[PDB]
Curated annotation (Swiss-Prot):
Entry function: Component of the endoplasmic reticulum quality control (ERQC) system also called ER-associated degradation (ERAD) involved in ubiquitin-dependent degradation of misfolded endoplasmic reticulum proteins. Could enhance presenilin-mediated amyloid-beta protein 40 generation. Binds to ubiquilins and this interaction is required for efficient degradation of CD3D via the ERAD pathway.
Highest taxon listed in the record's lineage: Eukaryota
Name this polypeptide is given: Homocysteine-responsive endoplasmic reticulum-resident ubiquitin-like domain member 1 protein
Subcellular location as annotated: Endoplasmic reticulum membrane
Ranges in a coiled coil: none
Gene designation: HERPUD1
Organism: Homo sapiens (Human)
Tissue expression pattern: Widely expressed; in the brain, expression seems to be restricted to neurons and vascular smooth muscle cells. Present in activated microglia in senile plaques in the brain of patients with Alzheimer disease.
Note: Although the precise topology is not known, experimental data suggest that both the N- and C-termini face the cytosol.
Induction remarks: Up-regulated by endoplasmic reticulum stress and CREB3.
Domain Ubiquitin-like: 8-70
Subunit structure: Interacts with PSEN1 and PSEN2. Interacts with UBXN6. Interacts with UBQLN1, UBQLN2 and UBQLN4. Component of the HRD1 complex, which comprises at least SYNV1/HRD1, FAM8A1, HERPUD1/HERP, OS9, SEL1L and UBE2J1. FAM8A1 binding to SYNV1 may promote recruitment of HERPUD1 to the HRD1 complex.
Part of the intact protein present: 10 to 90 of 391
Amino acid sequence: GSSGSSGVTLLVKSPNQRHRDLELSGDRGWSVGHLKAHLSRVYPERPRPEDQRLIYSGKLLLDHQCLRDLLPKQEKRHVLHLVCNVKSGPSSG
């Protein structure tokens, strides 16, 4: 994986489950699995990299997959869909 320019802009959108978007870097060298974590950061909440559901145009992302392969090689910017998933909450109260 020989690459080194700057990175790609990933538009972290939400499927009407939070609203608002977030544009972060998505270097073709990055890793879905890694990105997640990286996201959890920029994301105000500190979610999990295993929970963070990375989707691209509906197509759910894995983790080991590279953005290079995922993202195209022509278009500009990208619109991702990071779905946050907790682990049950303390109902009532």
